[PDB]
Design a protein around this ligand. Structure first.
Ligand SMILES: CS(=O)(=O)NC1CCCC1
Length: 150
């Protein structure tokens, strides 16, 4: 009973979380997951500021209200070569990665590793935070509050 959460650098408090190496998070799970990081789904304004500080990914993820990809450099296989906060318009499907916003993080680029999941609750799952540099932090718990997400 294990969940892997791959996380990024934070940029103005905003970071990306990918669960189990594939698009697998619902919007309700996303809010709960960010809550376990003492975080919230970013607003579009928070995401735009993070973009300006150096944040980009090549993965769709929830923010408040939309599913997006922040892009700095045009790349043909990431958001159809767009730059800026690219907003997903048309999709059949409902599961993506998530973004999260932690207000207590540094104001600009923070590429230190994540070494805690401070607000998870008691539960039976081995949850492992996986950093881009491969360093890991694991703890037994749960974060999902909606049964349909479990
Ligand atoms: C508040 S902090 O910068 O030390 N750590 C954050 C908490 C969630 C993302 C990383």
């Amino acid at each position: 009973n294990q969940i892997d959460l791959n996380v990024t650098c934070r940029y103005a408090g905003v970071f990306h979380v990918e669960k189990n190496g594939r698009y697998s998070i619902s919007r309700t799970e996303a809010a709960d997951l960010c809550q376990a990081f003492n975080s919230t789904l970013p607003t579009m304004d928070q995401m735009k500021l993070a973009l300006s500080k150096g944040f980009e990914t090549c993965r769709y993820g929830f923010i408040e209200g939309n599913v997006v990809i922040p892009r700095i450099h045009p790349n043909a296989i990431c958001a159809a070569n767009h730059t800026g906060v690219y907003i997903l318009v048309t999709s059949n499907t409902s599961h993506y990665d998530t973004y999260c916003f932690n207000a207590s993080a540094p104001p600009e680029e923070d590429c230190t590793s994540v070494t805690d999941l401070p607000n998870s609750f008691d539960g039976p799952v081995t949850i492992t935070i996986v950093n881009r540099d491969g360093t890991r932090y694991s703890k037994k718990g749960e974060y999902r509050t909606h049964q349909e997400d479990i």
